[PDB]
Amino acid sequence: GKLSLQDVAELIRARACQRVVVMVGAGISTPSGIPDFRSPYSNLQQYDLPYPEAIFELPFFFHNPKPFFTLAKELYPGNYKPNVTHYFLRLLHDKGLLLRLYTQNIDGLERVSGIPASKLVEAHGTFASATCTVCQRPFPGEDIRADVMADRVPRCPVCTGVVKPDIVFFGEPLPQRFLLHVVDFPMADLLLILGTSLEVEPFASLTEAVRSSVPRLLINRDLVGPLAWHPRSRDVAQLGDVVHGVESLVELLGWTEEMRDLVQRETGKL
Amino acid sequence: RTKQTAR
Ligand SMILES: [Zn+2]
């Protein structure tokens, strides 16, 4: 205390930190073109939302599911590519430093970036599976993909109700895979928080779940959530553009060449 | 423990 971005970089280079847990939000996906309703022509005006969080609210969805399924349509195919923040996390995995990446994003960029599903916790759900909003019948996500791409609201062939992809809405429980945090966060010897306002629970509360000895690096536009309210001696904030913060850390780590090579090959293949 | 906004 106080620790600096260079101190964290030197911990990773010394392999003093080998078990990095990462928490990311819509911050890391904006460089890729994907909107963030907390920001920014307005993302809300474009998606016709009284307020931002409405798009992931069941009451609003039942009144009008079109904004949600517009966003769903944009995200399904490879319309968007991973940016340097994704590839940084991929490189963390390639070097055997990533314990787990917890994401609030449903853009599937983490996977595309080449992070195995075993290393991912898609805490706010996935398009891979769907559920009837009335009769709770499960479906594979592929069934409703065609309907969503063709601008049709998918309906239950049993109950007649609206079938929704397994994106966690406000009021819904998180996927069971979220419970992996109970094992992961006590084991973490470094926590990275990238591109999140930590405005959504119980995801935000995970920042508190690491041992007090563990540095918490925030790379974000501004100091936020528990890290603002309940700081600790070994917290580091690199406030600014998330991609700038990441590239700064990459340079301090000495990975800039390796990153440049990785990003070129991987963006070549898309 | 379900999805809700913080504070
Ligand atoms: Zn049904």
Residue numbers in the entry:
A (entry chain A): 121 to 160, 165 to 394
B (entry chain C): 0 to 6
Question: What are the paper's exact sentences on this?
Answer:
The asymmetric unit consists of six molecules, each containing one Sirt3–H3K4Cr complex. The two globular domains of Sirt3 composed of an NAD binding Rossmann fold and a zinc binding motif are similar to other sirtuins. Residues 2RTKQTAR8 of the H3K4Cr peptide were clearly identified based on electron density. The crotonyl lysine is located in a binding pocket formed by hydrophobic residues Phe180, Ile230, His248, Ile291, and Phe294 of Sirt3. Residue His248, a catalytic residue for the deacetylation activity of Sirt3, interacts with the crotonyl amide oxygen via hydrogen bonding in the structure. Strikingly, the phenyl ring of residue Phe180 aligns parallel to the planar crotonyl group and has a short distance of 3.6 Å to its conjugated carbon–carbon double bond (C=C), indicating a robust π-π stacking interaction between the two functional groups. Interestingly, a primary sequence alignment of all sirtuins revealed that the phenylalanine residue (Phe180) of Sirt3 is conserved in Sirt1 and Sirt2, but not in other sirtuins, which may explain why Sirt4–Sirt7 were not identified in our CLASPI experiments. To further examine the importance of this conserved phenylalanine to the decrotonylase activity of the enzyme, we mutated Phe180 of Sirt3 to a leucine residue (F180L), which lacks an aromatic ring as a π donor but retains a similar hydrophobicity. The steady state kinetic data showed that the catalytic efficiency of Sirt3 F180L mutant (kcat/Km=21 s−1 M−1) for the hydrolysis of the H3K4Cr peptide was about 40-fold lower than that of wild-type Sirt3, indicating a critical role of the phenylalanine mediated π−π interaction in the decrotonylation activity of the enzyme. A mutation of the catalytic residue (H248Y) that is crucial for the deacetylation activity of the enzyme also completely abolished its decrotonylation activity. These data indicate that Sirt3 hydrolyzes crotonyl lysine with the same mechanism as it hydrolyzes acetyl lysine.
Lysine crotonylation (Kcr) is a newly discovered histone PTM that is specifically enriched at active gene promoters and potential enhancers in mammalian cell genomes. We identified human Sirt1, Sirt2, and Sirt3 as decrotonylases in vitro and examined the molecular basis for how the enzymes recognize Kcr using X-ray crystallography. It should be noted that Sirt3 was found to localize predominantly to mitochondria and was mainly involved in metabolic regulations through controlling protein acetylation dynamics. We have demonstrated that endogenous Sirt3 functions as an ‘eraser’ to regulate histone crotonylation in cells.
